[PDB]
Amino acid sequence: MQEHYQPAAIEPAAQKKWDDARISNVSEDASKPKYYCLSMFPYPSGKLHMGHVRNYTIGDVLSRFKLLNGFNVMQPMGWDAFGMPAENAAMKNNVAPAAWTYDNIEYMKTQLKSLGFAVDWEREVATCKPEYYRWEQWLFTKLFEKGIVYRKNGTVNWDPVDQTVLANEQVIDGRGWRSGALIEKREIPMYYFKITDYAEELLNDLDKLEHWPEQVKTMQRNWIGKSRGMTVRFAVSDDSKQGLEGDYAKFLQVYTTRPDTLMGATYVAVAAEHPLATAAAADKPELQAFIAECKAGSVAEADMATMEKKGVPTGRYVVNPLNGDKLEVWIANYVLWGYGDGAVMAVPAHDERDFEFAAKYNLPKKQVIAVGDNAFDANRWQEWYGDKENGVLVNSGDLDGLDFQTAFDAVAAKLQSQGAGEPKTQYRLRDWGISRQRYWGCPIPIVHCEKCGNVPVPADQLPVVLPENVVPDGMGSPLAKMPEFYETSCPCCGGAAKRETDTMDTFIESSWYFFRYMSPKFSDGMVSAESAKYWGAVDQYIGGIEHAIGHLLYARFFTKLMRDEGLVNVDEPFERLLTQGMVVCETYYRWINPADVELTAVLKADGLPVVISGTEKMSKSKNNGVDPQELINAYGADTARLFMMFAAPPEQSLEWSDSGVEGAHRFLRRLWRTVYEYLKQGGAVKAFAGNQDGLSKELKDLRHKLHSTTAKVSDDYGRRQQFNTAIAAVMELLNQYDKTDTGSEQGRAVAQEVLEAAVRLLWPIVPHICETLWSELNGAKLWEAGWPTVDEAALV
Ligand SMILES: [Mg+2]
Ligand SMILES: [Zn+2]
């Protein structure tokens, strides 16, 4: 055994000793209990970043732990290969997106092998392979024929200069963020997942997710947005039926979730495209220009309520079917057309949004709900206004004194008896568009025929192969400019036909890849019939916090889709959910990267003083991206993982510090020297076992700290997922070992038990150095020894 810790000597040797026995290559073995640990799989950006190292060390800690407890542990790894970054790296660097993507993957696969993640590399997957995306092309056609996937004209944002569809996250003051040119709303056909058909199941099955964080569950419920409310019809007054036609001249229909406040409505609001707005603006230009203002706007859903609520009145009036008060119709910029009836009512006294609206326009505020003896301030908002569970009605005639639940059913009875109302279930959730007017994505298996319509490619001819010998220039979809691709014969008649030149949303691959891992080479379907049974669903999912409302919901949706096609049994894909914290770092300018910078703050190369700015998430914007490759080169893979799991709990954010990195290194040198100096003073012994009534009190108390730590470390991996405190518990166990005289026959057998357990508890964190130190203390296979057991006799 070497006297000093040389991680470059042991880490690659321990890795080949791990490939020799193939410990992480798992198969369907129903003898050992299965455990499917999954890390969110990365995009081939080029090289790994510090955020990647956290995610995959958290997952490797959990996997190496469960595996040490005798589990069949599947920890697969793949590549989210499609996406725009390969297209921009193609436009700039004059490479093909495929050639760029494959060059990126092989470097990152080397970096991952350098960190020692016990990944089943025999299940590796790349989404840009026809071996993979054929199955989402296959699922497309099956659901397309079933109607769950369909084609319809929706409105999109077109950038006329840079020539591509844009998302509202990229629309700044009506102009694209790259060209800066005024964008045009356009009605193009798109393919849609009918996720609204699965809205109720996607909601109720959240309840069965016992180990999901209710913080995340709540977010899904709100994006789904189920609401039990009332559909009310306000009759158009005889003085305002002009311009309208049919039912629009007879009445105005609204939906409300609080019809127990129908007596409190003081004004209604329609959308800009509502016929009421078109009839009123027929001669009023300020109304015409306001309707034009709302249409040009492209307010994102992430910023949907950030907009100042505005609106002009119409001069037209409707009649409340209850109190009979004649209310004025308003055009408003929050009533969305296509989001239900396209027109709402407004009770300023009990909706905070309608309160801020009425105060803006001096519109009346009729209180109809009272909650106790509280004073109603018609000029200040109070929390007891929007109450739905504790208020009884007032200023409502016969409805005074009912709870909201009885007042709901009461108003429903009156409105239904007239025909002016009805109760209705509604969902904020809208269908899912998956059409990307880009190239580097999964093509859509639809062939257009002027006689047969939009026919899908049959399973025979799948996959519809995406050409890799393409370099996007920048002007529009490169596939629409390739007749050698889109020119084909119609599969339903034989005539000339164009393939669909759009590609699917890169979200599609991420919504089912965890199922492909179970049988990544299976040629007869998405997931093998036999392997989806043994693995069931993912037992642990670790990833970032970005796009949880998006991705996590889609995986839940695809799972239920695939479950309705005999492919899988489970209703839910992920059992346990852990979201890591971002890895942040300080920023420097003169933006200078922290790697080539030193502190007093001067440049590493020139000694040129550069100023230090605030810390951001590790990004390329402010040049704070710390390269984990440089980190491994300095101290090694063990020091990297140890620091990542020690600086903070996985949920909490992580401040990168160069000294804290060096602190994790010195602990490993201390752990190295500790085991060495023990073996220098007389080799190895057999670890202590059994009754202790006979040991010295100085040793009885160390066996206490031992099996106290052995329990706290097990609890910190399996229950709390607090790997930082787990490292601290082992450190304390070591600190008392150093203060204890172990130079006796019994003192040695305890020091073995202390050290044989300490290396095993820290193995999931730092497997290389622990595997090495374990080999010097015991010749049994470390996994044959298993997770350290807790002796309760040492605790009493
Ligand atoms: Mg359950
Ligand atoms: Zn045809």
Numbering used by the authors: 1 to 590, 599 to 608, 618 to 813
Describing publication, verbatim:
To correctly aminoacylate tRNALeu, leucyl-tRNA synthetase (LeuRS) catalyzes three reactions: activation of leucine by ATP to form leucyl-adenylate (Leu-AMP), transfer of this amino acid to tRNALeu and post-transfer editing of any mischarged product. Mechanistically similar to other adenylate-forming enzymes, the class Ia aminoacyl-tRNA synthetase (aaRS) LeuRS charges tRNALeu isoacceptors, which are essential substrates for protein translation.
Comparison of the captured apo and pre-transition states of both mutants show the same large domain movement, including closure of the active site by the CP1 hairpin and structurally associated α-helix (M84-N93), that were seen for the WT structures. Despite the occurrence of these substrate-induced changes, including the shift of the priming loop, no peptide-plane flip was observed in either mutant pre-transition state structure.
